[PDB]
Amino acid sequence: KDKLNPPTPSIYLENKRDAFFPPLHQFCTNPKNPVTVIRGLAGALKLDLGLFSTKTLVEANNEHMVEVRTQLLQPADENWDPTGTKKIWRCESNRSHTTIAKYAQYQASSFQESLREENEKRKGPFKTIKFGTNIDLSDNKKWKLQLHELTKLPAFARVVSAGNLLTHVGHTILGMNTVQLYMKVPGSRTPGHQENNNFCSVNINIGPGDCEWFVVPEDYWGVLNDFCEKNNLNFLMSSWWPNLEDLYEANVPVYRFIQRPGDLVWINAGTVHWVQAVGWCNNIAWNVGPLTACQYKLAVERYEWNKLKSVKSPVPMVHLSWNMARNIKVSDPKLFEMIKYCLLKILKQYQTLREALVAAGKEVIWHGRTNDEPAHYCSICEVEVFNLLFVTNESNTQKTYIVHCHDCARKTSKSLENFVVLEQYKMEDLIQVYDQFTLALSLS
Ligand SMILES: [Mn+2]
Ligand SMILES: [Zn+2]
């Protein structure tokens, strides 16, 4: 079917008016558009992409850390087993570290080398390449000019904004509400995935070369999960590169497009995607969480799925839900009902546990909290832990306060005799936040 190769939702910008036009924001967050390519974004805003060129990055912080992926240079849109015999989903990829200066040297000499090959005239086996990924641009003292340039974007796409759920978390989530950079050579691949907790993502290509993107809508993610399981792969944790002929056979639609320098790619919530560099280029990217029923729902879903799969959630959705109720006026009826429902479940579960502890003669110790204090996760199983923290007698004494969930504490100490129970929020105060959380009127 032609329906299996649909056109890319595209927007063509010419000037700042186009960029700040409110129907642009609405188009991107619309659940019917799995991806939006905003062409000419940098040119329309007069963004200086030069601030992210390799030459500029070397000057700024030449010893900055780069995560290296070593990969094979695969042909076109395919992925072959190392012997060149058959197309498979699993990708070979090995990890190491380097610096911006050292990777810059490789990026440049890579280009010079292919110029010489091009002037020499005249199934594998495949060449080996290196991809510089996940470069941390969180420090405002190291990247002042770079980060300031990105405040020129329209609000809905900024790293920080009043309408961004990740801004309301209240603390840093590295690489989600901070910027990451990528330095590439041709063939540099990002394997198949969904964003952390299904949050939207924003990506700008710095150039000078192009990237090629492959995209599948959220509601087909289960099909790809089966494919992984039938090929002995972990959908969430393994490196895989889909066989397009398999997807076509299974009637999965695939959006495919080219991202040129200055183009911005908006990946909508839960959209499955994978990417490869066509030329030599750098990219920047971060996450955003629009205030919509769709975004909140898909985020909660992935939060619960990660528990079943024993994978940590980078976004603490309990902590976030309470902050929304504390600080945000919500006027969408559907979104409001979702948050209210979740808070009620949290409150009931907490009341049940607390009464069980008291009925068994276990002391609950008032511990309170400092504000802007991040959410806590279990030091053993990495689940989010809210309000009641389980800490060993020894860790308490030393005031290291090393957090455990209730289940992990019980597994260690059958009657909790080795633990104390710390409480960060009074029940009356949580009940009030819940009771005063009501639907705001908006005529929009
Ligand atoms: Mn991504
Ligand atoms: Zn645990």
* CA-based torsion, 364, 365, 368, 374: positive or negative: negative
What is each CA distance from 328 to 59, 324, 333, 420, in whole angstroms?
A: 42, 5, 14, 34
Q: Which helix (H) or strand (E) holds 420?
A: strand 419-423
Give the C-alpha separation, 309 to 94, whole Å: 24
Strand partners, 258: 212
CB 325 within 8 A of CB 339: yes
Distance CA 161, CA 244 (A): 38
Contacts of 291 (CB under 8 A, 6+ apart): 163, 165, 328, 330, 332, 335
The values of phi and psi at residue 306, to 5°, are -60, -35
Distance CA 158, CA 288 (A): 8
State the maximum Cα–Cα separation within the chain, in Å, rounded to a whole number: 84
**Looking at domain 1-292, which CATH architecture does it have?**
Sandwich (2.60)
Strands 35-39 and 10-12: parallel
Q: Give the span between the Cα atoms of 317 and 188, in whole angstroms.
A: 33
Structure-determination approach: X-ray
Residues measured by CB to lie within 5 Å of ligand 1, the ion:
201
Residue 234, C-beta contacts closer than 8 angstroms, at least 6 positions apart: 228
Q: How far is CA 7 from the centre of its chain?
A: 25
Q: Name the token pair of 14.
A: 């010419």
Residue 417, CB half-sphere, CA atoms under 13 Å: how many?
2
User: Which ligand has an atom closest to residue 390 CA?
Assistant: 2
Which ligand places an atom closest to the C-alpha of 380?
2
Q: What is the dihedral of CA 91, 92, 95, 100, to 10 degrees?
A: -80
Angle, helices 333-359 vs 427-435, to 10°: value is 160
417 SS3 class: coil
Report the CATH architecture of 293-359+427-444.
Up-down Bundle (1.20)
Q: What are the residue ranges of helices labelled H in 3-73?
A: 16-20, 22-29, 41-45, 54-60
What is 107-159 written as a DSSP string?
Answer: HHHHHHHHHHHHTT----PPPEEEEEEEEE---TTTSHHHHHHGGGS-GGGSS
- Check the annotation: does 378 bind a ligand: yes
Q: What is the DSSP letter of 238?
A: S
Ligand 2 centroid to 405 CA: how many Å? Answer: 4
User: Residue 425 has which token pair?
Assistant: 């929020």
What is the SS3 string spanning 247-316?
HHHCCCCCEEEEECCCCEEEECCCCEEEEEECCCEEEEEEEECCCCHHHHHHHHHHHHHHHHCCCCCCCC
Q: How far apart are CA 65 and CA 136, in angstroms?
A: 8
CATH topology match: 1-292 vs 360-426: no
> Residue 146: which residues within 8 A CB-CB, separation 6 or more?
51, 52, 60, 137, 179
CA dihedral sign of residues 252, 257, 259, 265? negative
Confirm whether residue 211 is marked as ligand binding. no
Distance 256 CA to ligand 1 centre (A): 15
Residues 6+ apart with CB under 8 A from 172: 138, 178, 374
The Cα 365–Cα 422 span in angstroms is: 5
Closest CA to 187 of 171, 211, 219: 211
Structure resolution, Å:
2.0
Report whether 232 contacts 10 (CB < 8 A): no
Q: Distance from the CA of 239 to the center of ligand 2, in angstroms?
A: 27
25 known ligand binder: no
Sign of dihedral through CA atoms 17, 332, 291, 36? Answer: negative
CA of residue 134 to ligand 2 center, whole Å:
28
Q: How far apart are CA 105 and CA 358, in angstroms?
A: 63
Distance of CA 123 to the CA centre of its chain: 34
Could you tell me the residue ranges of all domains in the chain? 1-292, 293-359+427-444, 360-426
Q: Which fold has domain 360-426?
A: Cysteine Rich Protein (2.10.110)
CA–CA dist 46, 50 (Å, integer): 11
